[PDB]
Amino acid sequence: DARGSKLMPDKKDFGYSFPCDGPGRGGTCDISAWDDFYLAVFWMLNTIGWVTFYWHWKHITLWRGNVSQFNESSTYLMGWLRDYLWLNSSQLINGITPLVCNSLSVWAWMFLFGHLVWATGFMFLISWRGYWQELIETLAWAHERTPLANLIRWRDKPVALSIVQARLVGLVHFSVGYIFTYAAFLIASTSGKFG
């Protein structure tokens, strides 16, 4: 029901991205077939993570390999961090390491570039145009009011991003971080090794 349902019977002729609707009825929100697509892409970024995660740990261990290790250490969740994820960042995290820089530096800086692009998703995602627009209403009383900043016209009026736009941008942001971190993670660890 991109065509839509009870909470929306209508929900059509823009079917796709009409993100949001007024409050009341029950309270209505990310109920465009885009914002379910929008919502979908988190689990396509969670399957396509469990799956890939899996190969590698396996392979890794297989290569100077105990196999055993996955075998007891596939079994439970902790020590999926501890080894894998915690074993084998090893190397990368210092390419920086204070006593000077070792062979991979692109990767680890990418790997933190990885943790920022991600995190900075959240704004877009826990912010919701309302709060942003309003302080830009005060923050566009500056110039208009403050010297040597004045006369001076934007061609485009200041605004805060529409109410679909930022569900995207946090994402298309959540994604790079995320996909640029494993990018930098696996390589930054299947390269030294040990496997």
Binding site: R145, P147, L148, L151, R153, R155
Partner: protein
């Protein structure tokens, strides 16, 4: 006498606001800024351009000659024009393609004066494009140039202390 002017918020009507107060409007501030564009246009710009170009010019030296990328230089260049002279170019045209916000295009010609202007309604534009040129043209010969009697000078200099 009046507790602060004949006590008014703004020029007079309250309703625009700006809560005109010191640092908005004190006979003392206000004055430290009228050959310069804040209120009236002194002269048709062309000249304001370089006192603007130049003053802002020999700035951006110790910023990128004492805080430069691998700093405290042993080179003939810096102390230096160098990169900074490069910035006044990027700056100065980032500046021009804003004088495509106003074109409005004329020569009238008056740096010469008739009759105490008022501009009349200067507030807002009434700067044609053929104005904003002769400013950001003064800017180049204000930027690049104002970058040299910075380095030209030996720095006789004062030590941290």
């Amino acid at each position: 006498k009046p507790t602060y002017q004949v006590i008014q918020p703004i020029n007079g009507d309250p309703f625009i606001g700006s809560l005109e107060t010191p640092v908005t409007s004190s006979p003392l501030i206000a004055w430290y800024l009228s050959n310069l564009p804040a209120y009236r246009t002194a002269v048709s710009p062309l000249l304001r351009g370089i006192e603007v170009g130049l003053a802002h010019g020999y700035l951006l030296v110790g910023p990128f000659v004492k805080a430069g990328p691998l700093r405290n230089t042993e080179i003939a260049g810096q102390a230096g024009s160098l990169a900074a002279g490069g910035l006044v170019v990027i700056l100065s045209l980032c500046l021009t393609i804003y004088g495509i916000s106003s074109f409005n295009e004329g020569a009238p010609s008056t740096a010469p004066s008739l009759t105490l202007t008022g501009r009349k309604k200067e507030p807002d534009q009434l700067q044609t494009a053929d104005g904003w040129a002769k400013f950001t043209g003064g800017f180049f010969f204000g930027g690049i140039s104002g970058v040299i009697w910075a380095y030209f000078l030996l720095y006789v200099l004062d030590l941290p202390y």
